[PDB]
């Protein structure tokens, strides 16, 4: 139950990092959660 919220939130952050396009100035992303958790 926690892993699917932790991952659905993590996969949403990773989508937002890929959703921003280079060649436009944008905010530098945070570190996205932790991969080794769970």
């Amino acid at each position: 139950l926690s892993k699917e919220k932790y991952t659905r939130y993590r996969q949403e952050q990773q989508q937002r990092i890929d959703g921003k396009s280079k060649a436009l100035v944008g905010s530098e992303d945070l570190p996205v959660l932790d991969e080794n958790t769970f």
């Binding site: 926690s2 919220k5 932790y6 939130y9 949403e12 944008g26 905010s27 992303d29 945070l30 959660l33």
Partner: protein
């Protein structure tokens, strides 16, 4: 009776009671476990507004004007005309404050006697937050961790701590798991919207009791909040023409998202050697 200085306990009683209380104390004197409690507060916000409108004013026929474009066609045409005759615009011109604060592309076009003014602004913002307050404490002992600022609030005033706060009372039961009574919040003074009654504060507060295994990261709560607004001001029949109709209407759109998650990872310290590592 007890000696609070040496931390020693004085029992006077029969040899029979002594040998029985000696076992009760030995049972009740045991070493108690420690819990490292990490909270993980992740929030991500974003939203994008778009407000564009076309206003055309014609001397011969009439004008279409939309306030909320940030400048109306009437006050702009009085400012542009004033700018042509005088070569500049004084601060006393009423159009000064209207042009001085404006955002986005305002593109005018004159075809014959027809004036046309296009205003377009697309705003986009993004916000991301991560907090990881952690605290070590003995089981059944209440620990609190405050990082923030202590601000006065009106009522005569009163002092209020506002910041990242974690207040947890662990209970280790037994072997693995734990019982965490969590009271935490991330709050901050709101710089905008000050008032004579006092400051406001943006608070995200979660308080619950939960039972978590000793190594595991689990979700305490969360909020997924999503909002979309729209407004159009149009000319009634013309604004509904499928494509051309965007010339008559003034659209202002907005969207927002907030995805908040709160996680908690306890860890039990049984002995020193694991609490060095």
């Amino acid at each position: 009776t007890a000696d609070e200085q040496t931390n020693s306990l004085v029992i006077t009683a029969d040899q029979s009671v002594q040998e029985k209380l000696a076992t009760v104390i030995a049972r009740l004197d045991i070493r108690r476990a420690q819990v490292l409690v990490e909270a993980i507060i992740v929030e991500v916000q974003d939203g994008n507004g778009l407000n564009l409108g076309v206003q055309w004013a014609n001397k011969n026929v009439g004008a279409q004007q939309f306030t909320n474009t940030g400048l109306p066609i009437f006050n702009a045409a009085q400012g542009v005309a004033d700018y042509k005759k005088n070569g500049g615009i004084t601060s006393a011109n009423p159009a000064w404050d209207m042009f001085s604060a404006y955002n986005g592309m305002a593109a005018g076009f004159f075809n014959g006697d027809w004036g046309v003014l296009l205003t377009a602004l697309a705003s986009n913002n993004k916000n991301d937050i991560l907090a990881t307050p952690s605290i070590v404490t003995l089981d059944n002992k209440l620990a609190s961790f405050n990082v923030g600022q202590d601000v006065p609030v009106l009522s005569t005033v009163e002092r209020k701590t506002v910041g990242t706060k974690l207040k947890v009372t662990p209970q280790v039961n037994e072997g693995d798991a734990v019982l965490l009574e969590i009271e935490q919040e991330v709050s901050s003074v709101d710089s905008s919207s000050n008032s004579t009654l006092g400051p406001t504060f943006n608070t995200r507060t979660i308080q619950n009791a939960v039972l978590v295994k000793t190594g595991e990261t689990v979700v305490l709560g969360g909020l997924l909040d999503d909002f979309s607004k729209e407004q159009v001001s149009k000319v009634p029949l013309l604004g509904d023409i499928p494509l051309v109709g965007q010339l008559f209407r003034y659209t202002s759109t907005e969207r927002a998202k907030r995805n908040l998650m709160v996680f908690i990872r306890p860890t039990i310290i049984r002995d020193d050697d694991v609490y060095r590592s």
